[PDB]
Design a protein around this ligand. Structure first.
Ligand SMILES: Nc1nc(=S)[nH]c2[nH]ncc12
Length: 284
């Protein structure tokens, strides 16, 4: 299984689809996205990779995206899917059962608190209960069939709050806030904790990382990353976290760091073929 990077940003929005193998270290280049996008999210349902939302920043325009697009790794082809009800740049995305949840994001000055659900087998989106908060640059993660929206930006304030979506009830409820304000952090599930790595707090990009334990309902810092980064890509592969690219306040990183929880340590594991931020990332 590989870690896929889709889209991203470096001087403009990118179409690159590339896969890194932490086992042999190789980067293999696959089919370009139909439309370049940064600020998108990636996920996998039934082994198919989806690209959700984002934005095409080019010298000729800046268009937020409603597009959902699907990649088959054995056939190397993108297929357009039904679009969301609104464009969602800097979207968050999570998967519960077999449905794709599109969370937050922006459309111009509009900062969404709305959430939509996609059924890959029916190719339909439907609006779901909105969050308590407007959130662009939000991290989304799923634990025990529960959907977490973590941090982000409401248009005026960067956020340390997190809220939890209950599918059976169709309602959101706040949880304990993170210790650190973070928009554009990488958010994932590793074991039985929600991790939030990096981001931007409104003054600096962050290298700190913290994790949420649902049993105790508390957030705890762990070892920081080596590079401060916002708008990083994050995923979990064989019980380890990977962060891909991002921005440190000066440069777009190609650095890829890997966190080992048993040792609570980060190590640089590779460089992307080119620096970028705002990628979608998933594993299949
Ligand atoms: N790196 C940054 N991330 C966010 S979300 N906002 C920012 N303003 N200026 C830098 C950044």
């Amino acid at each position: 299984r590989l870690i896929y990077t889709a889209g991203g940003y470096f001087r403009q929005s990118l179409s690159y689809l590339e896969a890194y193998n932490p086992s042999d270290g190789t980067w293999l280049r696959l089919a370009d996205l139909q439309v370049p996008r940064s600020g998108l999210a990636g996920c996998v349902v039934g082994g198919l990779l989806y690209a959700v939302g984002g934005r095409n920043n080019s010298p000729d325009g800046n268009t937020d995206s409603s597009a959902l697009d699907c990649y088959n790794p054995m056939t190397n082809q993108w297929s357009p899917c039904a679009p969301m009800s609104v464009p969602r740049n800097r979207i968050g995305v999570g998967v519960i059962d077999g449905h794709i949840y599109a969370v937050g994001g922006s459309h111009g000055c509009i900062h969404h608190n709305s959430v939509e659900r996609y059924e890959p087998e029916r190719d339909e989106w439907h609006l779901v209960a909105p969050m308590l908060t407007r959130r662009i640059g939000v991290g989304v993660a799923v634990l025990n069939r529960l959907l977490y929206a973590v941090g982000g930006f409401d248009g005026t304030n960067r956020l340390n709050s997190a809220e939890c979506y209950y599918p059976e009830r169709n309602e959101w409820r706040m949880i304990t806030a993170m210790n650190t304000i973070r928009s554009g952090a990488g958010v994932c599930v590793l074991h039985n904790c929600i991790y939030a790595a990096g981001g931007y707090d409104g003054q600096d990009q962050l290298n700190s990382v913290e994790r949420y334990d649902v049993a105790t309902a508390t957030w705890t810092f762990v070892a920081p990353m080596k590079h401060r980064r916002s708008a990083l890509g994050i995923t979990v592969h064989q019980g380890r976290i990977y962060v891909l690219g991002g921005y440190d306040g000066h440069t777009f990183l190609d650095s890829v760091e890997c966190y080992d929880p048993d040792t609570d340590t980060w190590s640089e594991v590779t460089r992307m073929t080119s620096g970028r931020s705002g990628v979608g990332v998933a594993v299949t």
